[PDB]
Amino acid sequence: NVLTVYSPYQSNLIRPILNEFEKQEHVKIEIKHGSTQVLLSNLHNEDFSERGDVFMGGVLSETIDHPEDFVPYQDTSVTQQLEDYRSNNKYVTSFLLMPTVIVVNSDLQGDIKIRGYQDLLQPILKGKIAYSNPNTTTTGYQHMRAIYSMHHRVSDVHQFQNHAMQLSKTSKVIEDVAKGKYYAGLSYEQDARTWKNKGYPVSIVYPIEGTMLNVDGIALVKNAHPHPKRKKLVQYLTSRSVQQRLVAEFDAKSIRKDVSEQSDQSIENLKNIPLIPKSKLPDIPHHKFLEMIQ
Ligand SMILES: O=P(O)(O)OC[C@H]1O[C@@H](O)[C@H](O)[C@@H](O)[C@H]1O
């Protein structure tokens, strides 16, 4: 009856289009939410027979520690995807492009300038910046990579961590910044846009030193009784019309070549974002980088 999806995404991004899939395909979709690595660890310890069917969200092509929990599968539409971001992981289909961002409370900021990671180290901001657990979250892990990528110095990562408060959940960062508990935080584009569009005093900052771009992925979960419509769901989520819907409604950044680019107001087009070049990312395993910065 039920197709189960693991997703670190928030409900407001995926519940509507997953509802549209229910309406079109007459299948009931339930979502298991959580931090990326928490979902992957819970999935790993799940019986084959209780497991869900699809994992969507997170930098799956680079942070799946147990490939034996997934089925080798990429959607056929990878041929229509942007050349620079096609998954090199046979278990993962690229789904969305998600810039990681700095979020600033524009009511608390005042005259303080925050242009990137270096500005977060200003003494006035000490202990008043937040980020999420790099061991459990995609956002915290990708931000620590971005800081390390600046000069490939672990001391830069430690300097930031000694300056900021680590939170358990990524979405707690944007909530506490938007509500005025912190001056700034390390978040991602869609989560920042959710609260800014709700009227909260939130500024979205793309770090001038280099903005990490997440290639979010979709993967089929190895279970005993896979729902036979799960490949239709992956095709649905990576299709042109559905990707166009995500772009039009959320200012999402599509993985496809044949979908519009939309950067309403303070959301920036990828061409105007100082992305960290691939050549600056050292190609270091997920677990090893976490050992490096511990
Ligand atoms: O709670 P998490 O693990 O940070 O995940 C929440 C989100 O983080 C972003 O960085 C990713 O681009 C999203 O795909 C999603 O994973």
From TrEMBL:
The molecular function terms of the Gene Ontology recorded here are: thiamine binding; thiamine pyrophosphate binding
Give the protein's recorded name.
ABC transporter substrate-binding protein
Q: Name one GO biological process term.
A: thiamine transport
Tell me where on the tree of life, at the top rank, the source sits.
Bacteria
Pfam families the record matches: SBP_bac_11
In this chain, alpha-D-glucose 6-phosphate is annotated as bound at 36, 58, 138-139, 170, 214, 216
Q: Which PROSITE patterns match?
A: PROKAR_LIPOPROTEIN (PS51257)
Species annotation: Staphylococcus aureus
GO CC annotations?
A: outer membrane-bounded periplasmic space
Q: Which UniProt keywords apply?
A: Lipoprotein, Signal
